[PDB]
Structure formats: C-alpha cells, structure tokens
Write a protein that binds this DNA or RNA. Structure first.
Ligand code: MG
Lengths: 95, 82, 98, 106, 95, 106, 87, 97
DNA sequence: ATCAATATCCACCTGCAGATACTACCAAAAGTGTATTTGGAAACTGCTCCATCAAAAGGCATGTTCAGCTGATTCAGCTGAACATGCCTTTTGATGGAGCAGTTTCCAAATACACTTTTGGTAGTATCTGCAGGTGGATATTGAT
DNA sequence: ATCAATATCCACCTGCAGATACTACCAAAAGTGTATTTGGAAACTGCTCCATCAAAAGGCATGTTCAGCTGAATCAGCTGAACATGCCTTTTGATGGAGCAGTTTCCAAATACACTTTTGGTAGTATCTGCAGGTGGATATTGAT
C-alpha cells in the first residue's frame, strides 16, 4: 500500500525535453534513480561538512555551489554552477 | 555425486567473466584462485548486509541491506533502490 | 575435420561477452553459495530475490574488473596468460590485501 | 498556488528536495535558494546523461533506453566516467576493449 | 585565546593506566587526537546513516553498537562491544 | 554530583561526547546510553593503540612515545593496520621491509 | 604593495637526489633515469589536486590564508586522511 | 682506492631511510612549489606554515607509497629497476588513471 | 594464391513481457501569520605571516668509470585451447505460508528550561628530564686478493 | 680463507627544548531538578513474495591432441651506481610591519513553526507496442592446401 517516492518522473520529463521520441526501460529508470539519490547525498553531505567547518548552522546555495565545485570534474562542475545559479535568479525574479 | 557449493562456480563461467574482462589465455590455477577471491568478496559484503538485517530485527536480507553494504565497501551499485 | 587455432575462439568469446550484459554465472549455484556463506553469520535467513540479484551483479562486475587489471599485470610481465600471481598483484595494489 | 519548481524553470521538485535536506540531518537550517540550486544541478546532470544515453540507443537502432545505453554513455564520457568512477551500473556490461598485444599477428 | 579543546587528558590517563612509566610527545598526542576525532566521526556517521535507513530519529547505544560492528574489524569489534555494553550496563545501574 | 563518566567507569568524557553528538547533526535525538557506549569504544581503541605504542617505545629504548612508535604499532598489527589503512601518520615513516630478490647473492 | 618575485619552474626544486631518497624509503634499489621527470609529473598532479580543494575551502571561508585545516579537509575528501595537524 | 659494488650503497640507503622519518625533500623548494601552484589558482594567498608542512607530509607519504607499488610492478616483470611504465601500471590499478 | 568450413551480418516477421496511459484519491507541498535565529556590517585588536639580511653547511651539480642489469635471441618442453554430447544440474513455473509491512497504542525516555556547580583550558612563571647530537673507540661488513 | 677500508654500533656525557609542574582565574561546560513532549517497542495480522518442488530445459564434465606460450639460458651493449670534486642554496635566527584572522555588539533579514488549504505524485488499474528471438540467405573470416 504505502507510498514509495522516486524521481522516476521528473526524470521522464527531462527525457522528453531532451529526446521527445525516446523511451526508457524499468531497469534504466532504476539506475537513473540511484544516480539522483547518489549525487544528492554526495552534494548534501559535502555541503553539510562545509557549513559545520565554518560553524554555520545553515545550508545556503553557496554551500551547494562550493560542494558542486569540490565534487564534480571541470566542465561538468561548471555547466552545473551556471544552471544552478540561473535557477536561483529566475526563482528570485518571480513575484 | 556430491560437490562443494563454491565449485558450483564452474570453470566455464569463470572463463566467461575473464573474457568479458578481455583476457585471451588462462592458467589452470586461476579457477581455484578466483573462487577464493569471490568468496572473500561475498563474505565481506554479506557480513555487512546481514548486519543491517539484524539491526532491523528482520529475518529477511533485503535489496537495500545489500545496497547499503555495497556502498560502504566502496562498491556502490545502481539499480536496486537507494 | 575443421579446427580453429588456439586463440581464435578466445578472441571470438571476448568480442561476444563484451558486447552483452547478461550474467555469466548460473543462478542456482550462486544463490546456494550466498546462503552457505550467510548461514555462517546468522541461521535460518531468507533473501529477497532482488537482494540475490544485487549480489550477483556486484560480484560479476567486481570480477570482470579484477580480470581487466589482472590482464594488465600479465601483459606488464610480457605474458598473455593470466596467473594467480597477477591476481595477487592487482589486489595488492588496489589495497584489497597486503 | 505556484510550485517553486515552475517559478524556478525546473522539472525537478524543489519542494521534495527542500524536505530531503531538512530530514537528512545535514544542518539545523536550510536557505531558500539551496533546494532550487540543488534541484537544478540534479536536473542538469540527469539531462546530460539522458542526452548521451539517448544518442547511444539511437546508434543501436533503438528507441527505449536500457541500462547498457547508460553504461556506454557514461564510460565513453571522460567527465561522467570520473564522476561515476566507483559506481556499478547494473546490467551495464563493459566497453569493447581488447589489448593490442592480444590481437592476432597473422 | 578561545578555548580549543582536545582529548589530551583522557589520552594521558589511559596512557598512565597502561604504561605508568611512559610519556608522550605533543606531536604523538596530536596524532592521538586526530585518531579519536576520526573514529568518533566514522562511528557517529555510520550510526546516523543507520538510524536514517531505519526511519528512527534517535541514535541510541544500539545504533552505536551496530556502527561499531560495521566499522571495526573482528577482534577489535568484539572487544569494543564488550567495553561498550559493560559501560552502559554499569552506567544505567549507577543512578 | 558524579560525572556520567565515573558513573560508567570511564576515563573518557561522556558529557563531551554527548555534546559532540548533538552539535554534529547526526540525528534529531540522542539516547542517554549512546555517548556512554561511544566514549567507551574510543577509550578502548586508545588504550589498545597506547599499549602497542608503549611497547614500541620500550623496544627502541625510549621513555617517550613519538609518532614513529604509533606508526610501528599500527602497521605491525593487522587490525589497526586495517582500521587505519587509508590514514597517514605524520612523521611516522614506514616499516623496514626490503623485497627478497633485491638482497645480494643467491 | 611593491613587487614580489615571479615563481617559475619550481617543480625542479624536486631534485633527483630528493626523489631518489623517497624511492629508497619506498624500498627501491635501482632507478631508471626517466623516473625523475615522471615523478615530478605525478607529484605536480597530486599537489594541484589537493591545493585546488584546499583553496576552495579557503575561498568559501572568505579567508586569504590557507590553513592546516583547509589542507586536512582537502586530504580527507581525496581519501588521503592525515593525522597530526588538527581535526 | 676503495669501491662498493653497484647496489651496495643502494641497500644501505634503503635501510637508512626506512629507519628514519625526516622529510626527504628540502623545505624551501617544496614551499615555493606549493606557492607557485596555488598562485596559479588564486593570487594573493598566504599560508599557515603548518599548511605547508601538512602538504609536504602528505606528498612524501603519497610518493613513498607509490614507489612501493611501483617496485612491486618492476619485480613482477622480473626487473629490479623501476621504470615509468611501472609507475603507470601502479597508478592505473590504483584508479588514479 | 582457391576453396571449403563456418561464423557473422542483415532483412524481415510477430507475440507478449513490459512499456505507456489513465484515474482517482490523498499525503505533503504551498499559503498565511507570527515566533525565533543568524549572519553579518562596522570597529577593533594582537597575531601569525611575509619579507629580508647575513652567515654557514650541508647537500647539490657534474663528469668519469665500469659493474652488472636489461632486453635480444634462441629454443624445447609443458600446458592450456579446441574439440563433440548425454548426463545431469539448472531453469522454469506453480503453490502453501513465513514474516515484512500496515496500524494502533501508550509510557519510558527524550527534549526543554532555569538554576548550580565543576572542570578543562591557558597563561604566567618555574622547574625538570629525556634525548638529540657530539665524542672516541671497540665490533662488523665488504671487496680486493 | 686473510687482510684492509670503512661503515656500524653502542655506550657514556653536557646543553637544552620540550615536557611536565604548579598557580590561579574563570568562562564555559556539565550537572541537577522539574515541567513537557513523544518516538518507537509491542502487539496484532493482512497479504506479499519467498522457499519448495515437479517437469521442462540446455550447459557442462570429460579425455584427447598438439599449437604456441612460457621460462630457461646465453650474451652484447649500454645504463645507471658509485664517488670525487667544486661551490650554490638552503638552513637558521634574527627584526619590523601589516595584512588579516578572530571577537563583540546591535539588528534587519532570513528561516523555523503551528495551522489550513490546495494539489502533484503515487498505487492500482487499463491499454498499448518495442524488440527479443526466430528464420533465410548473403557475406565475411579463417584455415588448409
Ligand atoms: Mg605562475
């Protein structure tokens, strides 16, 4: 009965934005889920650490940004910081 | 005709793994050596999975128990939850 | 009476098994091994089906990788035949042992 | 009532992510930006991977992405291979790769 | 001038109990301090992950113990576990 | 007023361990016996390292434990060696060990 | 400020003898002549990786001074935990 | 005039440096190298002296370990002279490359 | 070289295991209104950190010599690849029931809050002691003969 | 073996840095004692999904044969170890100045918290179809002659 939450869905939307004529298997989606959870845990935990190292009690987007830089390779880190920065701006610039 | 479970990991199976591995030619002592290695792998993972199981007061080892056991042994596995 | 030269099937089998993703150990025997091993830590245990498939995926992935490294060790020593010592050297350097 | 996701321009769920941050014991408090930023980074990487997986199914004359496609897309990309260097992709197999010295001479 | 704490004292007491005629250099003590902070973090971390996996909001001595088992090797575990359990039993019965 | 340490019969500070479990964001709540158990576990490991380090100091005719003695102790003990397999002890050096084939003659 | 001498080619301060000494502590009896440059390359990469990460901690704390802790945390991230300098 | 044969001082040096723990690279050069590299990441940085020492302790420990692995790779190929390919094979199997 | 044996690729077909699609709740996001909390923005310290000068050693650079290691070459013997199939273990699919998971309950145990008491850290001075680094000088180790 | 060069060993001996020793102040913990909240163990049980097993399935054990790989042996060439020599650069230890970590005190801005709407996201159910295998015939690769 009880709810089993996943990203299997946001993933499907992104798939449709990126390859509208392409589907995905059950297993494949399982992998993508693990992926999202994994990266989520890596970034959060590193953010958690930064905040603690600086005796701060709060995880802001700056802790996320720094984490992403520490966790991701060169270009990957970089197309990513932009995306993240963009989202924040757009969410802010939105009455 | 009895047999050691570990010997259930057959020379042809082991060879297949090696072939996925890109290996062209195999000494005959590899099969026993491989069995040993494989046993220590499963020992380590299973020990940690089972530890998770008992912590949950269960009598079933779940995919998550395994996944988590894998993760902390530095063998993270995608596709079985988590 | 036709006959392929030593090496030619082996290569063929490499090209084959690198192309595919099916498991390569037979399930029941892998499954029995899991249970034998687990019995030593806790008795009368049950395993989700997917808990056993997880294990099998992980082991196979581990061993194939070890074989890649093992093979590089044989090649380093100017051989093309993988011996135990190659497996020991790879584990040694991976930090799994010694 | 407007989802923070739609405000942010995102498919991925800012709310859910905000919540997972609260209840994973990462810190006493959580900025408003933090889950937007994170959600966008997760969506981004998801995209990049689906994109390359996509192409790999296409290349194999297929329309439905399977774990294999995800393996070919990750291990053939230098940066994704690094990010996921200690991860096993179930049902992924391995890249076709034979050491030159093992190839037949004649 | 701010109070920077360490486990120097505890470490020195335990040293006197096991080698009463033996001293410790401040470099060596720094190492010991690193060691305790490290093991502290490793156990505390495993226990946190553990509780969370089992949807508990509480880290009890039971989560410490399972962490210990996950973290330490064989004979170190066995012994750590007995000293642990022994310290709890005694503590519980000493109010 | 009895410290919770003496109550538990420990040298290591239970209160301090309790506080660190709180401030480290490990979970919502901390059971009363966790810091007791944990402080005991750390006390035991430190007792164990000190024992072997002391011995190593005495072997080298020394009264004072320096970092080399911690390193000799840790690396000559299988289990400590494993527990600390990815750790560097500053000023530790390495274990004397020369591969047999490198020694002269036959 | 007034001047501050340009730093260039300091990798060469990792001299051949120093490298030979590191190798001896690692048990090595005979050393190919090409090892020296190869080791300098490997060393540079390891330092760049650690320093990159430490400096990222420095910038995040808004300091201009890289601390031992900054280094210690970079080391740990990178699976080369170091005892003896704090943390 | 007197000559030790090739290897005999090598073995002496191994026993000597395996027995001691002092840093084997000169401090001042190592420090310049650390400042060069960081300066290329961010200008106008200062370093706590113990930061530099930490870096140096950590680099020397990393290379000493890599030299051990490198040595095992040479011996595996029936040599006693470590070569770049030995460093390369060790790094690949470590997952550094 | 040509030629036969056999593996591999490619085009097409088609049932169904496994996708995608739809519906309809509902847990959990969003909206609202107070109730804390926090991260600075300024405004000062005392540091460590940087620079720099001079003396001094301790180690670095270099060139020469040749020991002995590496890699080439050659080869015999041993050892693993390739080989056909029925015996037998694994695979598949059908069926009771173990126990995971859903739900509810309630108190032993947790947080919270405001006092009271103590200890662990530092800083000022003071003393001490282990051992680093120097000294011969008696005991190996090595390599030439 | 025997002999000479030189590295090694060890043990005693003074200066002294780093260790231990108080002393004393105190500020921040830690502890103590109510008042208050609740997490999760305990007990009951619904219903997946896991162990068991019967018939259907197809991979593997076996023993023989010899291709070609591995490991041994020899050896010429040249690379890297040892060592003497000349002297640059690191080490060591001063001195000043300041750039900057590290604090503290006040709020405006931000985030948590209790309470109510208002969906987005899930489970359960209902259609829909991509492609896993099958076959047929052309084509490519391998190995013998
Ligand atoms: Mg530069």
């Amino acid at each position: 009965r009880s709810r089993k939450e996943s990203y299997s869905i946001y993933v499907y939307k992104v798939l449709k934005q990126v390859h509208p004529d392409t589907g995905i298997s059950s297993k494949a989606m399982g992998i993508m889920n693990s992926f999202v959870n994994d990266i989520f845990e890596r970034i959060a935990g590193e953010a958690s650490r930064l905040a603690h190292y600086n005796k701060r009690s709060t995880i802001t987007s700056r802790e996320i940004q720094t984490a992403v830089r520490l966790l991701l390779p060169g270009e990957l880190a970089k197309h990513a910081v932009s995306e993240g920065t963009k989202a924040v701006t757009k969410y802010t610039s939105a009455k | 005709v009895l047999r050691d479970n570990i010997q259930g990991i057959t020379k042809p199976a082991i060879r297949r793994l090696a072939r996925r591995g890109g290996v062209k030619r195999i000494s005959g002592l590899i099969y026993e050596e491989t069995r040993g290695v494989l046993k220590v792998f499963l020992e380590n993972v299973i020990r940690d999975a089972v530890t998770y199981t008992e912590h949950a007061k269960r009598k079933t080892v779940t995919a998550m128990d395994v996944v988590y056991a894998l993760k902390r042994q530095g063998r993270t596995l995608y596709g079985f939850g988590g | 009476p036709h006959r392929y030269r030593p090496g030619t099937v082996a290569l063929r089998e490499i090209r084959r098994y690198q192309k595919s993703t099916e498991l390569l150990i037979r399930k029941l025997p892998f499954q029995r091994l899991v249970r034998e091993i687990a019995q030593d830590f806790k008795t009368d245990l049950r395993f989700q089906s997917s808990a056993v498939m997880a294990l099998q995926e992980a082991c196979e992935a581990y061993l194939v990788g070890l074989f890649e490294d093992t093979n590089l060790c044989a090649i380093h020593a100017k051989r093309v035949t993988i011996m135990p010592k190659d497996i020991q050297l790879a584990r040694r350097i991976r930090g799994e042992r010694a | 009532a407007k989802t923070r996701s739609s405000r942010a321009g995102l498919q991925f769920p800012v709310g859910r992510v905000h919540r997972l941050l609260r209840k994973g014991n990462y810190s006493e408090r959580v900025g408003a930006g933090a889950p937007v930023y994170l959600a966008a980074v997760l969506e981004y990487l998801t995209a990049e991977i689906l994109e390359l997986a996509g192409n790999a199914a296409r290349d194999n004359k297929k329309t439905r992405i399977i774990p294999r496609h995800l393996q070919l897309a990750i291990r053939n990309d230098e940066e994704l291979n690094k990010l996921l260097g200690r991860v096993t992709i179930a049902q992924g197999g391995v890249l076709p790769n034979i050491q030159a010295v093992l190839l037949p001479k004649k």
